[PDB]
Design a protein around this ligand. Structure first.
Ligand SMILES: [K+]
Ligand SMILES: [K+]
Ligand SMILES: [Mg+2]
Ligand SMILES: [Mg+2]
Ligand SMILES: [Mg+2]
Ligand SMILES: [Mg+2]
Ligand SMILES: [Mg+2]
Ligand SMILES: [Mg+2]
Ligand SMILES: [Mg+2]
Ligand SMILES: [Mg+2]
Ligand SMILES: [Mg+2]
Ligand SMILES: [Mg+2]
Lengths: 740, 739
């Protein structure tokens, strides 16, 4: 049946919303351009600009290098997709009867092999763009945030947040518009075969996350090598400020924030958005919506994202125009209110969307069977994801903000040294997983019960329906991070650094939250994808108690540890090289410590560049090859266990690592800020307590910025990869069992 | 058909081998008593006053601890009787056999009562396991010290002999009490072997239940002391490890016995007991138990019987035949024990498989009787036997300072504590790869040949050499105490260097112990899980259903929740300990100088208090989970909980224990300075050394409190779920029956 919203309306609505989000982005970038600076104390404006140029140059330089390799791998992998998928049917041009309706004729598998390759390259390119554009806004906004810190926290908050919003709206609108264009273009060929149309479209999410994996790991190793070395020698060893221009590793540190925390994070979340939409589309494609060619209801997930863009635009105005911050304690609650307002507004918007864009009754594909589902049930599926996210947000704030006991107790444990700081920080992280998991479990149960894999997919998308805002508050953080980096390097007033420090502490929390959303939605979408894989692979039952499934389960559960081993070791080793180099300069460059001689920043940039371009390959190989090796050698049943295991296991370590690192960082920020009697008693900077906090913070650096956040990509990537290659594994896989 | 070995041969063989194991243990204790002492000669007295202090403190805490757990044990036995008694409304009449409708079985109420009995038997045998181990350990520690005056080889021997006393006593005792209980229970049950062995699984629930609290309680006690002592003593005050001026040193050394010995003993007993019981429950409704073939039915105990003899002979090799002259011989001699035992036991299992099984039989396999050949069972127990050896090898590689991973971790101390920790975390994560593969291969091989019986019997294979296993492991804390006593006795520097060498090998040895514990825990839990699914009459555990999946993800979360509790508890107590040690050094005149004596008792009290109180919540989480989920959500959801906690929890268990042990041995590497590289990180007190100590104390709760207790979390929930399966299947799933 039709929805109230006609098919042609939907065709207009979606791009109109994408354009509005892009226009909003441009507008905000315009208001940000009103902060003037140039390299041509006017000396402080000039100095900020030179430091900005050095960071902008370094970030653009690394991404070009990183993206070169990644782009080459993308082209190579696109060839694997075409060959493997095309080999399922012997590269035949013959049409065959539709698997979803034998009375109809469908386009040949070969075309779907071709179009899958096309959508994979689309998604890979859009992912690269997402990280790159993010880096361009951040390296533009950073020094403008620093100058605005002269007028106070509030003002600096606005430019950092407006800019964060520039990244959020661009990335969401562009991801939505590309997906919308791909669908229409593919439709010209596929016609009434919507089954094959949306099967080909799933490459979009595979391309998104493939590129994101390397972006996150690569950028992550770069930034943390620099960060750890800079901090340990400068702060623990040489008793100088954080980001002191005498430190040779500092430019690389600050390039690092843009190259990992921004560019990697942006690709990462684009991957989340693309997989969630694609997962919803495929299940819908062989459900009542796709089978009856009802465009509006078919595109229900895109309509949800369209309204999310508009909802977030409104929400943004509360932080941007309707409120002014005047005190430091207002920063975090303003960020939190962004999540609360969007959640409340999006709940109404999802209700409207479910009312106009769905028929009241319809059927959802449920493992071979059409299940009767009502529109108010679908409303609940997306709403429970959206609300699970907010919960995850509130909980993650509790565990990572220095406004609450857990982090203050972590800081407090520094009084007995580094070892107690770390014991307390590890325990906090472990503790932190409890409620997010229960929230995710509730989303799964609710959405699984109402609408099977479609419901779960749409719950994932629900959690990401407010992605423009989520990205805004997240991207706000590394921009505020660089801003204080620039303030210190430019030799600015202490009052400036105190304000940037307040913005940056809130950005640590907001970064943790962003990881909570990525992990939550990854658990959801991976389960939707897992269930779709099982159908696509003609598995009758994924039975835990068969030898093939179980070995997949326990091996899958180990993958996140193997992956974390590799990334931790990489950062550890490169940071070790970094400490040696920084020590060498402090110890052998005459006048460096006295500020009369300038250090060699390029060498530190090179150390972190060489380690990340090299060391990103094994962890990327582990994730990308696992489904292929398991699918080809052991078959689809074993891969099933691998998908379930990696999901349930990876999510625990992902969460605990991200929150542990977050807690260590803000515990240190709390000592640095000395804003209460307790904080002050752990001070001053340079005290044994502070240096113990720094030890904890630097251990947390690769935890929260390299391994931790990349884990969500491991999970969700192996799941789309498995789905896309499913026909190939089902037909030509399981070799070991076939030859024995 | 039947075996070559007659039922009566088996009835005699099993206790004969136990009593041999006890005799051989009683023997080694006599030899150790040839070393004499009572409270140079100034030293011998001091060593004995120190020993007495440690022995007094160990005994005191266990009585306190065992008092709490014994009372919990009585409370829980009541729940077993009630819940299992309620399945058939406390009827006294027989009913149809759960495994065969066409037959009549003993009433469920009787089985409710015998489960309670075997539970209490298992609890008591678990405390006796822990207690005896503590007795011999606190007996042999000063005796290892005084024979350290006469070189490494001597001290090693009295240490290893004393560890054999524990290994052989626990192994022989656990086997004898089970054998006896089976024979006693068989009086009532008669031909109903299904009911007999369903009752007997209480034994496994008993051992592991009391083990949970002894590992956790004992683990929190020891690491509170350990961390406080090492932080104020070595980091802050620049005084030697185990220095008598440090008020926490008695508590530290008490802790090695109360935790690493007693807790660990209970732990491995539980492993032994659950493994045997799991093999018995599946066999009992297979051709062996249906044809009432007593020999074949008791195949698991016959494997354990020969295991003792094999370990006895293996022991002679390190005790008699060979002698250590260079410290670099210790680690090899201990691994030799593993290799020799694995080789001799491969022969013994083949023999046992040849004489105790029919050539063909059937194994219960989810409703269907599955054809299995005795040569296939041989491979099931052997594959578990060899997976254990592989796990030991890989664990040595990642924890011993004779290889690159640990040496690299030590090396990273040049760049501070932060790099030491990052490198140690990564080593732990990395260390899980091969053990999981070995475990997955054992699972595939044993599952394919013989379903859950095969898996259960692969678990027992990995624990078939448990006497040797416990011997090498118990050797460690004795050696650890031995050097603590040496230093407290003010003895020469060469004494401490010897004991430090012994102590270092014992670190690796403890990591290996944990590998066997986690390896067999994965295997037994999987078999138990499979028996739980049958007993609860679940057709299929389908991962893609809402009930199973939410159980899967929540179960995967449980080991982190558990790790959170046990780490914070150590972190909190050790924070107090540091403040207490600082207080004594900063208030008591003559303390730092050495003209005054510290109050050791305030440190004992801090860790005593913290452990007794803080062991409760993680014990609650583990005991309550199957009850809460089974009653509220049902057997489908609990099935997910069991699978998820298993696959998730072994990862964090392995990584935590190896990271911990690696940090410890990297520290020992620096403290020994036995190479140019080691020496370049020294001397003791250097920045590198202090960074190592930071890492070591972080690894303390990881490897001694949370890590090793994780293996108990997993196997405990599994038997707990199996025991209460009829109850959950009948009266559980409430939330779904209401809404
Ligand atoms: K941040
Ligand atoms: K030890
Ligand atoms: Mg830093
Ligand atoms: Mg930064
Ligand atoms: Mg910074
Ligand atoms: Mg930060
Ligand atoms: Mg950092
Ligand atoms: Mg210690
Ligand atoms: Mg000790
Ligand atoms: Mg010791
Ligand atoms: Mg040790
Ligand atoms: Mg220790």
């Amino acid at each position: 049946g039709a929805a109230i919203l006609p098919d042609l309306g939907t065709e207009i609505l979606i791009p109109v919303c994408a354009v509005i989000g892009i226009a909003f982005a441009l507008f905000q970038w315009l208001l940000v351009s009103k902060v003037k600076l140039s390299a041509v104390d006017h000396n402080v404006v000039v100095k900020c600009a030179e430091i900005q140029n050095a960071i902008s140059e370094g970030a653009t330089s690394f991404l070009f290098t990183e993206y070169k390799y990644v782009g080459i791998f993308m082209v190579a992998f696109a060839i694997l997709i075409f060959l493997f998928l095309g080999s399922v049917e012997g590269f035949s041009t013959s049409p065959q009867a539709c698997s979803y309706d034998k009375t109809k004729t469908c386009k040949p598998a070969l075309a779907t092999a071709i179009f899958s390759t096309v959508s994979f390259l689309l998604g890979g390119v859009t992912s690269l763009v997402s990280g790159f554009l993010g880096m361009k806004i951040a390296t533009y906004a950073n020094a403008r945030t620093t100058l605005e810190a002269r007028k106070g926290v509030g003002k600096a908050f606005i430019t950092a947040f407006r800019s964060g919003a520039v990244m959020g709206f661009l990335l969401a609108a562009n991801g939505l518009l590309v997906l919308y264009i791909a669908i229409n273009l593919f439709k010209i060929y596929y016609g009434d075969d919507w089954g094959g149309l949306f099967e080909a479209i799933t490459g979009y999410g595979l391309g998104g996350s493939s590129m994101a994996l390397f972006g996150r790991v690569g950028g992550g190793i770069y930034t943390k090598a620099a960060d750890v070395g800079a901090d340990l020698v400068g702060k623990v060893e040489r008793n100088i400020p954080e980001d002191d221009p005498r430190n040779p590793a500092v430019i690389a540190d600050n390039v690092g924030d843009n190259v990992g925390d921004i560019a990697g994070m942006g690709s990462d979340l684009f991957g989340s958005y693309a997989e969630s939409s694609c997962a919803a589309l495929v299940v819908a494609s062989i459900s009542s919506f796709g089978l009856n060619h009802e465009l509006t209801a078919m595109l229900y997930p895109l309509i949800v994202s369209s309204v999310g863009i508009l909802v977030c635009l409104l929400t943004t105005l509360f932080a941007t125009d309707f409120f002014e911050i005047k005190a430091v304690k207002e920063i975090e609650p303003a960020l939190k209110k962004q999540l609360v307002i969007s959640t409340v507004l999006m709940t109404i918007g999802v209700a409207v969307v479910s009312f106009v864009a769905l028929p009241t009754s319809f059927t959802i594909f449920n493992f071979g069977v059409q299940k009767d589902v009502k529109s108010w049930q679908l409303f609940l599926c997306v709403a429970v994801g959206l609300w699970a996210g907010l919960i995850i947000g509130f909980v993650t704030e509790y565990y990572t903000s220095n406004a609450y006991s857990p982090v203050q107790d972590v800081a407090d444990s520094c009084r007995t040294g580094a070892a107690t700081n770390v014991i307390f920080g590890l325990a906090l992280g472990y503790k932190s997983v409890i409620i997010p998991i229960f929230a995710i479990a509730i989303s799964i149960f609710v959405s699984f019960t109402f609408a099977a894999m479609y419901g779960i997919a749409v719950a994932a998308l629900g959690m990401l329906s407010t992605i423009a805002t989520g990205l805004a508050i997240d991207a706000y953080g590394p921009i505020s991070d660089n801003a204080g980096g620039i303030a210190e390097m430019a030799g600015m007033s202490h009052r400036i650094r105190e304000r940037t420090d307040a913005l940056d502490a809130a950005g640590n929390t907001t970064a943790a939250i962003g990881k909570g959303f990525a992990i939550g939605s990854a658990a959801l979408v991976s389960l939707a994808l897992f269930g779709a894989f099982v159908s696509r692979a003609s598995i009758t039952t994924v039975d835990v108690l068969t030898p093939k499934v179980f070995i997949g389960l326990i091996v899958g559960a180990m993958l996140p540890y193997w992956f974390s081993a590799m990334t931790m070791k990489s950062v550890g080793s490169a940071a070790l090289k970094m400490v040696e180099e920084v020590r060498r300069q402090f110890n052998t460059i005459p006048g460096l410590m006295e500020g009369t001689a300038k250090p060699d920043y390029a060498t530190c940039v090179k150390i972190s560049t060489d380690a990340s371009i090299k060391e990103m390959i094994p962890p990327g190989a582990l994730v990308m090859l696992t489904p292929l090796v398991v699918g080809i050698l052991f078959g689809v049943e074993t891969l099933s266990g691998v998908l379930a295991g990696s999901l349930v296991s990876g999510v625990q370590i992902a969460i605990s690592a991200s929150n542990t690192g977050g807690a260590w960082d803000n515990a240190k920020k709390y000592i640095e800020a000395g804003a209460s009697e307790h904080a002050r008693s752990l001070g001053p900077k340079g005290s044994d307590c502070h240096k113990a906090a720094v030890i904890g913070d630097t251990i947390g650096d690769p935890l929260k910025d390299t391994s931790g956040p990349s884990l969500n990509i491991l999970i969700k990537l192996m799941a789309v990869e498995s789905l896309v290659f499913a026909p190939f594994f089902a037909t030509h896989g399981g070799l070991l069992f076939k030859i024995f």
